[PDB]
Design a protein around this ligand. Structure first.
Ligand SMILES: NCC(=O)N[C@H]1[C@@H](O)[C@H](n2cnc3c(N)ncnc32)O[C@@H]1CO
Ligand SMILES: NCC(=O)N[C@H]1[C@@H](O)[C@H](n2cnc3c(N)ncnc32)O[C@@H]1CO
Lengths: 146, 143
């Protein structure tokens, strides 16, 4: 898994075309979204991750929760972004993992938004440009699931 | 070299704190920028790249031009972004490659802009949400 964390003034998106044969079904309310004061997590689920979806999910939750706490962000936004890596996991695995991360972060008490998986989106972001405003992590499973 | 290409309505930046001991010397004018209708090229120069700075520059220039032509962008903005990779080049090498990338795209007739190197920067970008508007590439020498 590759994660790119952008501490932002806002994040907005507009659902445009479908980018997969199997996109996440979406409601009308999900076509557009916007969130202010927000740790935006751009995430590519990698092929390596398919080995243990739960381990990398847990690890992504912990890691992102920590950057949010040291930048004082109460809002986090999970943003599917296949473009952060070259050895990409299969959509279905990626969709699963992005949800566990998302739900994982909600369970921690944060205010979490998400953009729909499987679509091209217009997006706006405004990076704060602090030392801690731009961070990346590579998170891989250390051992296969049971 | 990792390259992330974002066809945007605009790109806008503001230099904040220095992120290296020796950041690229810049003018006051260079402290803020903006460019519109722009292919934005976020680039991380990687350690592997040090083996052939000219070869990697060349295929980066060619690759970025190709997308710029597909996307119909006349404006290209070169945006140094270390966080596209964890396996980075040394700053001196990173700047050499970025300079070549800049001048190579300037050579070809694009309206080319850059952000200052060695700094933390606040930035704004609006991605057009088109199929071709987000593209990434790994570009690595083969001596
Ligand atoms: N809006 C820019 C975009 O990235 N669109 C992506 C993601 O929404 C999603 N996607 C597919 N595979 C993956 C993956 N392995 N990891 C993360 N997302 C994925 O499917 C789209 C087409 O690849
Ligand atoms: N956006 C904010 C930022 O990334 N700031 C980075 C880059 O401008 C630059 N930098 C250093 N090394 C590299 C490299 N190998 N490739 C690209 N840029 C580099 O130095 C800053 C601190 O690492």
């Amino acid at each position: 898994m590759r994660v790119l964390l952008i501490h932002s003034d806002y994040i907005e998106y507009e659902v445009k075309d479908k980018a997969l044969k199997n996109p996440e079904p979406i409601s009308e309310d999900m076509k557009r979204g916007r969130m202010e004061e927000v740790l935006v997590a751009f995430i590519s689920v990698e092929k390596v991750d398919e080995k243990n979806p739960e381990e990398v999910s847990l690890k992504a939750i912990e890691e992102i929760s920590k950057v949010a706490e040291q930048v004082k962000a109460e809002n986090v936004f999970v943003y599917p972004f296949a473009h952060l890596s070259s050895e990409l996991a299969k959509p279905s695995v990626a969709m699963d993992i992005l949800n566990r991360v998302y739900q994982g972060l909600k369970e921690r008490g944060f205010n979490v938004g998400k953009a729909p998986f499987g679509y091209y989106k217009a997006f706006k972001i405004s990076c704060k440009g602090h030392p801690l405003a731009e961070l990346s992590r590579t998170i891989v499973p250390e051992e296969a699931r049971v």
